[PDB]
Amino acid sequence: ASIFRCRQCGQTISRRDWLLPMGGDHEHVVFNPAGMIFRVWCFSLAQGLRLIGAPSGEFSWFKGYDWTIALCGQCGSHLGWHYEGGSQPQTFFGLIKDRLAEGPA
């Protein structure tokens, strides 16, 4: 139980070791404007994604941060968001926990 892969395809995405307490917890439960609930795990680092477009501050769940959609770079599944433009840290990834699979390295 050390690496996180895309649930839909198996692409390598992140690692347990890279979880990031933001505001004291790596886990944040949030809703978007369409009411969808997301159980977001914050990671300092991730790979295997494709970050789409340019950042936006609109509706940001994390104060001082702008976001880009993060798709699985292999299959296109929406795995979460990349956050930037903030402070301590400047950047991080917020990934949707139930869209990843955890397993051995």
Ligand X SMILES: O=C1CC[C@H](N2C(=O)c3ccccc3C2=O)C(=O)N1
* DSSP SS3 for 86: coil
42 burial type by CB count under 10 A (0-12 exposed, 13-18 middle, 19+ buried): buried
Distance (Å, whole) CA 9 – CA 71: 12
First to last CA, the chain: 8
Check binding of 32 to ligand X (CB under 6 A).
yes
Q: Which stretch binds Zn ion (CB under 5 A): 22-30, 31-39, 47-55, 71-79?
A: 71-79
The option from ligand X, Zn ion, none interacting with 71 (CB < 5 to 8 A, set by class) reads none
Check binding of 59 to ligand X (CB under 6 A).
yes
Residue recorded with tokens 């397993």: 103
Binding-site member from 12, 61, 77, 86 for Zn ion (CB under 5 A): 77
Give the residue with the Cβ less far from ligand X, 21 or 57.
Answer: 57
Compute how many residues bind ligand X; rule: CB under 6 A: 9
* DSSP SS3 for 96: strand
CA 61 distance to own-chain centroid:
12
Give contact residues for Zn ion (rule: CB under 5 A): 6, 8-9, 11, 72, 74-75, 77
Interacting residues with ligand X (CB under 6 A): 32-34, 58-61, 67, 81
